[PDB]
Amino acid sequence: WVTFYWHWKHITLWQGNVAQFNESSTYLMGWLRDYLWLNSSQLINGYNPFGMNSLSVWAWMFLFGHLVWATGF
Amino acid sequence: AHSVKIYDTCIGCTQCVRACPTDVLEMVPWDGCKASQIASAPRTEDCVGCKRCESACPTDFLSVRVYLGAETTRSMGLAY
Amino acid sequence: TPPTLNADTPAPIFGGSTGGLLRKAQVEEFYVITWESPKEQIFEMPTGGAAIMRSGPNLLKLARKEQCLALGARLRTKFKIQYQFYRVFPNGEVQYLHPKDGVYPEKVNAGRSPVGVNNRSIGKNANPAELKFAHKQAYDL
Amino acid sequence: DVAGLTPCKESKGFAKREKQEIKKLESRLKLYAPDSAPALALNATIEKTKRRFAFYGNEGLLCGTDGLPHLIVDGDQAHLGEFVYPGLVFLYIAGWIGWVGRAYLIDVRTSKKPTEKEIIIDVPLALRIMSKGLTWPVAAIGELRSGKLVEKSANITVS
Amino acid sequence: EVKIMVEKDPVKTSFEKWAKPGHFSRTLAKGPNTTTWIWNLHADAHDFDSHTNDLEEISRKVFSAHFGQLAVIFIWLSGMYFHGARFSNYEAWLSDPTHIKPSAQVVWPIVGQKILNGDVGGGFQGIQITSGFFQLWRASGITSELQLYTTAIGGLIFAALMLFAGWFHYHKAAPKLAWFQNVESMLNHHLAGLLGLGSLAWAGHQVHVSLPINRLLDAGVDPKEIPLPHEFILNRDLLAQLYPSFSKGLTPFFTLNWSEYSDFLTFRGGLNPVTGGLWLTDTAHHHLAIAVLFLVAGHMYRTNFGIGHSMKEILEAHKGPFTGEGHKGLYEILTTSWHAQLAINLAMLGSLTIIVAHHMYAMPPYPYLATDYATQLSLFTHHMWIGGFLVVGAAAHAAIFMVRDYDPTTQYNNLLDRVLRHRDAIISHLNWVCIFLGFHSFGLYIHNDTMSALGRPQDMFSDTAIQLQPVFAQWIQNTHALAPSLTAPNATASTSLTWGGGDLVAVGGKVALLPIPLGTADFLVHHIHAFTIHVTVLILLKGVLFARSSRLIPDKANLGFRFPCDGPGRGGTCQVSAWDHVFLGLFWMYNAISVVIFHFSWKMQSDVWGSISDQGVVTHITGGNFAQSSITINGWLRDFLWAQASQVIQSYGSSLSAYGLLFLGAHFVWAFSLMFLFSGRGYWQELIESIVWAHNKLKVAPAIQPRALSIVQGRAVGVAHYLLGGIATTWAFFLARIISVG
Amino acid sequence: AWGQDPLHVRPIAHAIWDPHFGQPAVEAFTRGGASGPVNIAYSGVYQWWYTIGLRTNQDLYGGSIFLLFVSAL
Amino acid sequence: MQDVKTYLSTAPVLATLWFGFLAGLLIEINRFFPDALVLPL
Amino acid sequence: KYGEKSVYFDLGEIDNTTGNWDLYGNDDPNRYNGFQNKFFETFAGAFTKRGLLLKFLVLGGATTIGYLGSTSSPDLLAIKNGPKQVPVMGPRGRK
Numbered sequence A: 001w002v003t004f005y006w007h008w009k010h011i012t013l014w015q016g017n018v019a020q021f022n023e024s025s026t027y028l029m030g031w032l033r034d035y036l037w038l039n040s041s042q043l044i045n046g047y048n049p050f051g052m053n054s055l056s057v058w059a060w061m062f063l064f065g066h067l068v069w070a071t072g073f
Numbered sequence B: 001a002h003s004v005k006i007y008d009t010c011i012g013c014t015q016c017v018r019a020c021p022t023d024v025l026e027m028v029p030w031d032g033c034k035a036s037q038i039a040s041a042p043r044t045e046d047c048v049g050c051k052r053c054e055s056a057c058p059t060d061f062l063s064v065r066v067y068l069g070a071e072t073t074r075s076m077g078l079a080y
Numbered sequence C: 001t002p003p004t005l006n007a008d009t010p011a012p013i014f015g016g017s018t019g020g021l022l023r024k025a026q027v028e029e030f031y032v033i034t035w036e037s038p039k040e041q042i043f044e045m046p047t048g049g050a051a052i053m054r055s056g057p058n059l060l061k062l063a064r065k066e067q068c069l070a071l072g073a074r075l076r077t078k079f080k081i082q083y084q085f086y087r088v089f090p091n092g093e094v095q096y097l098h099p100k101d102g103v104y105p106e107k108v109n110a111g112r113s114p115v116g117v118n119n120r121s122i123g124k125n126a127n128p129a130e131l132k133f134a135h136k137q138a139y140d141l
Numbered sequence D: 001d002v003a004g005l006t007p008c009k010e011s012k013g014f015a016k017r018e019k020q021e022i023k024k025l026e027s028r029l030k031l032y033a034p035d036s037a038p039a040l041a042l043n044a045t046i047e048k049t050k051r052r053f054a055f056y057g058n059e060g061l062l063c064g065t066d067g068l069p070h071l072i073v074d075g076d077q078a079h080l081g082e083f084v085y086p087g088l089v090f091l092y093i094a095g096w097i098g099w100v101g102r103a104y105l106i107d108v109r110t111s112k113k114p115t116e117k118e119i120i121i122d123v124p125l126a127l128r129i130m131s132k133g134l135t136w137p138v139a140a141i142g143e144l145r146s147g148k149l150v151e152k153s154a155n156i157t158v159s
Numbered sequence E: 001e002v003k004i005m006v007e008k009d010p011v012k013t014s015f016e017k018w019a020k021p022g023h024f025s026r027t028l029a030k031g032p033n034t035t036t037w038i039w040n041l042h043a044d045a046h047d048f049d050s051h052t053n054d055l056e057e058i059s060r061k062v063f064s065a066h067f068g069q070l071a072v073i074f075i076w077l078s079g080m081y082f083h084g085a086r087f088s089n090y091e092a093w094l095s096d097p098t099h100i101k102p103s104a105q106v107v108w109p110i111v112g113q114k115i116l117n118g119d120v121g122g123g124f125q126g127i128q129i130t131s132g133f134f135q136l137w138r139a140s141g142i143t144s145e146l147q148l149y150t151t152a153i154g155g156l157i158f159a160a161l162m163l164f165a166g167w168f169h170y171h172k173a174a175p176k177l178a179w180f181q182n183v184e185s186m187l188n189h190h191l192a193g194l195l196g197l198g199s200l201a202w203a204g205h206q207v208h209v210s211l212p213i214n215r216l217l218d219a220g221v222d223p224k225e226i227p228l229p230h231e232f233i234l235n236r237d238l239l240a241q242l243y244p245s246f247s248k249g250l251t252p253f254f255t256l257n258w259s260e261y262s263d264f265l266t267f268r269g270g271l272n273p274v275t276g277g278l279w280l281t282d283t284a285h286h287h288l289a290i291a292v293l294f295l296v297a298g299h300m301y302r303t304n305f306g307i308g309h310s311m312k313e314i315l316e317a318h319k320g321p322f323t324g325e326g327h328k329g330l331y332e333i334l335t336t337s338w339h340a341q342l343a344i345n346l347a348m349l350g351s352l353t354i355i356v357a358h359h360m361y362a363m364p365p366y367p368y369l370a371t372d373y374a375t376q377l378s379l380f381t382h383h384m385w386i387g388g389f390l391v392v393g394a395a396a397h398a399a400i401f402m403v404r405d406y407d408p409t410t411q412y413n414n415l416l417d418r419v420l421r422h423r424d425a426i427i428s429h430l431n432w433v434c435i436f437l438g439f440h441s442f443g444l445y446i447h448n449d450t451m452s453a454l455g456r457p458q459d460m461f462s463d464t465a466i467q468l469q470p471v472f473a474q475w476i477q478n479t480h481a482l483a484p485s486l487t488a489p490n491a492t493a494s495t496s497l498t499w500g501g502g503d504l505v506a507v508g509g510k511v512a513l514l515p516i517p518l519g520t521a522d523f524l525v526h527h528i529h530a531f532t533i534h535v536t537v538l539i540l541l542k543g544v545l546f547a548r549s550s551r552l553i554p555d556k557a558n559l560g561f562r563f564p565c566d567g568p569g570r571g572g573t574c575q576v577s578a579w580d581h582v583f584l585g586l587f588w589m590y591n592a593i594s595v596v597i598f599h600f601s602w603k604m605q606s607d608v609w610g611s612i613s614d615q616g617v618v619t620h621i622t623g624g625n626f627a628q629s630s631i632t633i634n635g636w637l638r639d640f641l642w643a644q645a646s647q648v649i650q651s652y653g654s655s656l657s658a659y660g661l662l663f664l665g666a667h668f669v670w671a672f673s674l675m676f677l678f679s680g681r682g683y684w685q686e687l688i689e690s691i692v693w694a695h696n697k698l699k700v701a702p703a704i705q706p707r708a709l710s711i712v713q714g715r716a717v718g719v720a721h722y723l724l725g726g727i728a729t730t731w732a733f734f735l736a737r738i739i740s741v742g
Numbered sequence F: 001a002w003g004q005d006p007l008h009v010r011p012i013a014h015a016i017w018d019p020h021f022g023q024p025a026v027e028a029f030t031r032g033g034a035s036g037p038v039n040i041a042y043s044g045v046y047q048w049w050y051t052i053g054l055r056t057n058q059d060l061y062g063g064s065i066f067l068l069f070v071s072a073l
Numbered sequence G: 001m002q003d004v005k006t007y008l009s010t011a012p013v014l015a016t017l018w019f020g021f022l023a024g025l026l027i028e029i030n031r032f033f034p035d036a037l038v039l040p041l
Numbered sequence H: 001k002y003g004e005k006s007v008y009f010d011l012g013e014i015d016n017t018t019g020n021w022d023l024y025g026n027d028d029p030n031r032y033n034g035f036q037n038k039f040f041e042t043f044a045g046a047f048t049k050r051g052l053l054l055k056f057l058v059l060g061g062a063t064t065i066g067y068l069g070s071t072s073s074p075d076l077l078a079i080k081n082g083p084k085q086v087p088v089m090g091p092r093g094r095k
């Protein structure tokens, strides 16, 4: 929770659009839509059927983490 | 190699002995209870650690206690 | 009592199973349970399945002491049948085990000595800090 | 005013939000017959929105940059209705329910079979206890001072 | 032998036991001491065989309870019909099926709920429904709200009748045990009457009512101008105008000139071009043929009249040199234990429900159902989930039978004993199969992911790279597509349009059905399905086979069917009971069904559903990305979950906001279940001790002592909240997406 | 190079030698002014070392040798 | 009739009646006094 | 297993009693040709010792792996081939 809050606030600060945080942080759908889904685009497009970027290793690590976390269950 | 201890609050109802699946416990003549008998644990090398004896003991707190320890091919309950 | 010996008595009528003996019986101990039946009856094998016990002596090889004791408990509480079982080692040594002095453990018998009895309540045991850097366990005292 | 917040009536963004909501509702309304039931329902919603915005503006609420009302709970005299008054009302109601529950438990404790009354409620006794809860603060302070509210010999574990 | 045997006034009707909460159990009747009593009361309520030991009372209770469930179902059906008669736009939809969204639920204006009343069309505001009742009513020939209201009143009357029948047969005239054990007579009566006569009656309704009304509707006649159903019975001239063979009466039927009726009893495949549904004349010939077949089948078993087969002799006859005594002893098991019958019936019903889902998407039976994408997706997913639940219940209650009602005396050397005697081999070989399937399928997916990340797409298992074609499925498709020419010559078209051969059916600018290509991705996904299914079967079968004993615990049958453990000894014996095996099989069934419904949704949206314009050019919803993007886990995560969840997360402020709210709430409930799943009872008991001290300090401790939930109850609560959360998440996601883009 | 232009150069953590790569990955991971695939550092040690007076590669080498000696001690 | 009164005093039935009355009261209050954010008094 | 009757326990035959049998073991001494055995015992007999085999395996594996890794041609390994395109600039103009 702490790191999510810090990261979203600083993302909005660095992009100059603090209004998005000021308006969307008061409800949970705002978090789920404007932080995670919004900022996962370039991550999940690290490698696709059209090629790969330098974010390919981070996309692979993202899937690896989801998988290990699932395996712990 | 589990260890089973009997404490002097026993009333000699013999439920622990009947509940034991590996014949670890037995009744011994005693003085100190109306039944005039107490439980003993001579075959502790055969104890598996199921703690049925503790579940069968009527007493505020248990008169029979099982302390789990070193594991052996008999304690692990291995048929192979 | 004088512990009994072993002999060559017939086995129950069983058609086989995959729950029988394994290499542990070959390289370690295995157990044999003996009993006498007045008539042929169908009973459930502790290893899974149904068997027929012969009229007269019976003998059965089992892999664990728990299997022997469960079968014996069922025999005693359901068929009113007295039973014995032993422990067999690979070299041929035989150890008589269940009715150690001929009396079942739930009946008090003379000549038995207490083992593991502590003459106090469970709340009077010592503290682990008192027996620090010592090999005692605070329930062995 | 407080923390650089402007009043709702003076603020722009409150009026912009009202205009946007009314415009959306009328855009929805454009699809129906004037006298049909959907038109009447949409008109009722529009009037309710107008009344709500007027009441919020006239009640004296502060407004943020985004155009939404904000609440002040530090004890300010100009904003007691935001927190302090509903808080007092809730405290009264919750103390009432808790006090009558405790009284019923105490009265049931001395019975032939308290557990039966614990699952099957004695409705007349419950109603009497419930009605006597109007003056719960006075009775609560009375038992606090009389020394009949707390216990001293309770079951505990090995310390 | 077979006769009616009842007892007069067995149980007196009184409210005395309504004031004794735990009357049915001898231990619960004494009242509560701890909070465990409440859970035990609500948990043992309908477990009849644990209360008494005689089969007669159990059978009578089962009969009356089944009457009660029938009454509840009748109330539900009446409610659906009434709410469609008064709170729906069914008539406006009848006028314009392709533009009016079905709606049958209306919300009150209270707290802003107004926004949920969407603009479905027809001058109506309400919640869009996906149950497909409008299509069923249109296929039945209903054209007014008066008929629906009459059906609702009839349903209420039937509910009252079922309630009275249940009361009568428990409290007044209870059948004896010899009545319930007439399995031959029960099969004869049910198989002939309930199935054949019901199918014959529905065929009669179709022929005499539904064919003319739907024919007129498809022609273009306004619904208000169509004559009422009785006018086709009182005046056969109209029905002969529509189908000329009715002018001959029933003479061709009795003279065996059945070819005269070929204009309303057809055998033609495909779909109606106007409505995108199956021809109703085929449905007539097929409910009629089913009626005939079931009526013939129901005259097979022996009864008071000598002729017929006897099931005991049939079972005792089929045995061979590999199986000892064969099927001997099964008749007594199946006529003595309710749990074995429940297991068999649950397994068959679940498998049948899954078959229903498949056959219903592949051959849409109702008019304007194929082009209603939301209804198709909803029906498929719903009946698939139902089938999965039933097949898990089969294993649960089979294990219950094995623990309780099994008797080694009757089963000496028959199939049950010999199955119980080679169980280690079965479980070992099935374990190997599960491992092999998991590796050579999910490892293929991981290999594809790694190749794609490394920039080596030429080393992947794709259509453009190394290929894995499903040659057997392709051959079966081609064979079924060429049937109307060689092996089923009397058919006009193939059974469904999904086979490779055929054409496109479009209704209102939308594709109804289309040939479904199978490639490498389909190979991968069916072998994933095989993996998950064999694993679920492994879990449930291991639970059933080792329910009575094992090498670890030789006397498991003494501990019961539902027990937590047998202590921390032998290394630890947590979850050794068949109940916990069902508890894990539920999770694996959830996994399997989730993968199945995801496969269906993506494949349909990517290759079948879409909009067609002039010159016959087809544009699909996701543009055919299933073949390339479904070969990787990243492909799924990006192009299905991330892409298709945009609708549910952007539904706030519209009529679809409830779907987003329940999406969030379901993620929440699924997370909430993990605290019951991951934790143990002792922690909560000690915390409750501290809280009880706090309440004791103020003289307000309860009389019924609070207790932490039992171990089995903790597991059950965890699995229940987990399943609810996951399924509701998928529900909200699917409904939002398909209502938005469908 | 980073010291010359701190705001326009990406620091390099370590080089990559992965035999399992293909050519597109080798092209994609060649960041900075490197002659091969590298990793961009996100630990902040460039800024820390630059602030405390370290300027060239010889300084870093001397520090590495000294820390080897300290660990041996 | 005494048994019926005893049954109607059970915990689930009384809870259902009480919560139904409370929900009805709250719903009617919000029908006649809607959109209440701050307490006017 | 004495085997005379339904007796399967016998202390005299403990290997039969415990089921310690050789299911498919065959003890026919004649399998191969004499000259084949001569050649194979002459050549393959060097690796019979196990410690020397371990040392030889480790040294040979290390040497082979190092030689192949350090002398592989660029046309086979892409990592040795290196980049061939112009580098791509970062988001904010950071290289």
Ligand code: CLA
Residues within 6 Å of the ligand: E062, E063, E066, E067, E070, E179, E180, E182, E183, E185, E186, E189, E190, E193, E194
């Ligand atoms: C032609 C005769 C006939 C018919 C139609 C049925 C039909 C049915 N039986 Mg059945 N039964 C029969 C003969 C018949 N039985 C005989 C001869 C025996 C004794 C051997 C039994 C013993 C039996 C048991 C033990 C049970 C059933 C059950 C059921 C129901 C299964 C649920 C279902 O399919 O819901 C579909 C529902 C419908 C299609 C609605 C049909 C409308 C009503 C219910 C038709 C009632 C037919 C009935 C025979 C009339 C009795 C005469 C009475 C009016 C005087 C179903 C209604 C089960 C059940 O649910 O119990 C209630 C059950 O547990 N039957």
Ligand SMILES: CCCCCCCCCCCCCCCC(=O)OC[C@H](COP(=O)(O)OC[C@@H](O)CO)OC(=O)CCCCCCCCCCCCCCC
Residues within 6 Å of the ligand: E013, E014, E015, G001, G004
């Ligand atoms: C409409 C569908 C059906 C609904 C339920 C109908 C119930 C009919 C009676 C059933 C019991 C038959 C046996 C009687 C005998 C019986 O039950 O036990 C017998 C017992 C006798 O008690 P007494 O004190 O009279 O006698 C004790 C003896 O020891 C000496 O006389 O109680 C009664 O007679 C009460 C009968 C009515 C009990 C229920 C009263 C309330 C019923 C309705 C509740 C809802 C009302 C809603 C109003 C809007």
Ligand SMILES: CCCCCCCCCCCCO[C@H]1O[C@H](CO)[C@@H](O[C@H]2O[C@H](CO)[C@@H](O)[C@H](O)[C@H]2O)[C@H](O)[C@H]1O
Residues within 6 Å of the ligand: E233, E234, E235, E236, E237
């Ligand atoms: C199981 C049965 C359930 C339904 C029960 C009620 C059945 C009612 C339908 C049966 C009558 C069949 O009706 C069919 O033959 C009738 C004559 O017999 C025709 O009736 C025609 O001739 C009659 C004289 O015989 C005239 O009085 C009618 O005005 C004329 O329409 C109908 O035009 C034709 O549709």
Ligand SMILES: CC1=C(C/C=C(\C)CCC[C@H](C)CCC[C@H](C)CCCC(C)C)C(=O)c2ccccc2C1=O
Residues within 6 Å of the ligand: E675, E676, E677, E679, E680, E681, E684, E685, E707, E708, E709, E710, E711, E713, E714, E715, G015
């Ligand atoms: C949370 C948790 C608990 C604690 C949860 C408890 C005690 C359940 C509480 C259920 C409800 C909240 C009790 C409600 C009591 C009355 C019905 C309240 C009536 C008054 C109004 C609220 C209606 C366990 O006991 C437990 C046991 C084994 C494994 C995991 C867990 C576990 O995770």
Ligand code: SF4
Residues within 6 Å of the ligand: B004, B019, B020, B021, B022, B023, B024, B025, B046, B047, B048, B049, B050, B051, B052, B053, B054, B066, E569
């Ligand atoms: S723990 Fe089990 S085996 Fe050990 S003494 Fe107790 S009952 Fe016997």
Ligand code: SF4
Residues within 6 Å of the ligand: E564, E565, E566, E567, E568, E572, E573, E574, E575, E711
């Ligand atoms: S952890 Fe729980 S389930 Fe496992 S042995 Fe201990 S008490 Fe039993």
